[PDB]
Amino acid sequence: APAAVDWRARGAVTAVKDQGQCGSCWAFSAIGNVECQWFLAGHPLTNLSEQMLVSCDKTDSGCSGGLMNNAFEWIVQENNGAVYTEDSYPYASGEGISPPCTTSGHTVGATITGHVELPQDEAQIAAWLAVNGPVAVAVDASSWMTYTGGVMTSCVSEQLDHGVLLVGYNDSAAVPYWIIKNSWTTQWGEEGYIRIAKGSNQCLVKEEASSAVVG
Numbered sequence: 001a002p003a004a005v006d007w008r009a010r011g012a013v014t015a016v017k018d019q020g021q022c023g024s025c026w027a028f029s030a031i032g033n034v035e036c037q038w039f040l041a042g043h044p045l046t047n048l049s050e051q052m053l054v055s056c057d058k059t060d061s062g063c064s065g066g067l068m069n070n071a072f073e074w075i076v077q078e079n080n081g082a083v084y085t086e087d088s089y090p091y092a093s094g095e096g097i098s099p100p101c102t103t104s105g106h107t108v109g110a111t112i113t114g115h116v117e118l119p120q121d122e123a124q125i126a127a128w129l130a131v132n133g134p135v136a137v138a139v140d141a142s143s144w145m146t147y148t149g150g151v152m153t154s155c156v157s158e159q160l161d162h163g164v165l166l167v168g169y170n171d172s173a174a175v176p177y178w179i180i181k182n183s184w185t186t187q188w189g190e191e192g193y194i195r196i197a198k199g200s201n202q203c204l205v206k207e208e209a210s211s212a213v214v215g
C-alpha cells in the first residue's frame, strides 16, 4: 500500500460542512461518503443533501441520531438509490428542528446501488481506503470538543457516539495517524479535520466502517 494517502489533498472531498445543534452527524458522514464515491466513479464532485436523510429517512431519528449503514440502506430501498443535491434539498436543521419530509422540488445529484460494510480491522480498513476512497466511520468523539490540533493520542474510547468521514492516513509520520473530516465547520480542529493515532483502535474507529457503492 502507499505509505500515505490523503483524498482531500487529491481533491476528492467536498468542503467541511456545519451540522449545527442537531444530532445529524450520521447524515453528514453518509452524504460525505456518497459525495466522494460519486466523484471517484467518474462524475463531478457534487454537494449532496443531508436534509433528505434528516427529514425523510424514517429508519433513523433525524436530529436524534442514526446509523450510516441505515442511511445507505434507506437510499437504495426507499429512495430508488437517488441522492438529491444540497442546493435542491438544503440543510435546514441547524437549530435542532428538522422540517417535515417533502417529496417535491428536489433534484437527483447522485445514485448508489448499495453499500459495503468493512471488516472490524483497521489494517483492512486502511487497505480499502487506499484503493476505493474515503470511508464513513463511527467513532468515540467524546474527547473531541477539546481537540485543538495535532495527532490525538488521548481518544477516550469507551462508546461510539459520532459519525465522520475517514479521508486518509499517513504511515510515514513518527506517530502514524488517520485523517478524518468532521462536520463541525472549519473553525474546529485542523480546518475542520482531525488526526487520530492509527493502529490501536483509537476512538473505536474500526468498529463500524462502511461505504456506499456506485454501480
Ligand SMILES: *[C@H](CS(=O)(=O)c1ccccc1)[C@H](Cc1ccccc1)NC(=O)[C@H](Cc1ccccc1)NC(=O)OCc1ccccc1
Binding pocket: 019, 022, 023, 024, 025, 026, 059, 060, 061, 063, 064, 065, 066, 067, 068, 070, 138, 139, 141, 142, 144, 160, 161, 162, 163, 208
Ligand atoms: C451525532 C454526533 S454529534 O452530535 O455530532 C456529537 C459527536 C460527538 C460529541 C458530541 C456530539 C449523533 C449524536 C446523537 C444524537 C442523538 C442521540 C445519540 C447521538 N450521533 C449519532 O447519531 C450516533 C453515531 C453512531 C454511533 C454508532 C454507530 C454509528 C453511528 N448514532 C446513533 O446513536 O444511532 C442510534 C440510532 C438511531 C436510530 C436508529 C438506529 C440507531
